[PDB]
Curated annotation (Swiss-Prot), chain A:
The chain holds residues 34 to 99 of 99 of the full protein. Changing K61A: Impairs heparin-binding activity and leukocyte transendothelial migration. It comes from Homo sapiens. This is IL-8(9-77). Disulfide bonds join C1-C28, C3-A44. Coiled coil: none annotated.
UniProtKB/Swiss-Prot annotation, chain B:
It comes from the Eukaryota. The gene is CXCL8. This is IL-8(9-77). Disulfide bonds join C4-C31, C6-A47. The chain holds residues 31 to 99 of 99 of the full protein. Changing R65A: Impairs heparin-binding activity and leukocyte transendothelial migration.
Amino acid sequence: CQCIKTYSKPFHPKFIKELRVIESGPHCANTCIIVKLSDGRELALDPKENWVQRVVEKFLKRAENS
Amino acid sequence: ELRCQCIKTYSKPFHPKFIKELRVIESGPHCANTCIIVKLSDGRELALDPKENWVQRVVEKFLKRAENS
C-alpha cells in the first residue's frame, strides 16, 4: 500500500509544498495522505492523527489564499 | 522543467462523491497560481479554481471524508 510506513514526527506546515489525498480502493483499503516538502521528500501521513489534520488544514488555507 | 499544471480551470457541474484523488500544488516560482486537481472515478481530471468559495468547501469536505474513513 501507499501508506504503510507513515511519517510520525510533527513538522510545521510551512515546509509542505504539495498535498495528495488518495481515497481507499483498488490499491489500498486506506485513505492516503502524501505531502511533498520543500526539500523534495514525499511523506505519507496518518489522516487519523490530530497533528496531521491540523497541519494539512493550515497548508490548504495558505495555498487557497496565496 | 515543468510550469503550471492547471492553466484552464473546470466549472461544469460534477458529483463530488466521485472524487478519488485530490492534489493541491501551492504557487511558487514554477507557477503563479495554486492548482487544485481532482481525479474522478471515471478517469477524468478537473482543475478547479482555489479562490472559488464552492471549491474550497468541496476540497474541505473531501478531506473530512478522508480522516473519517
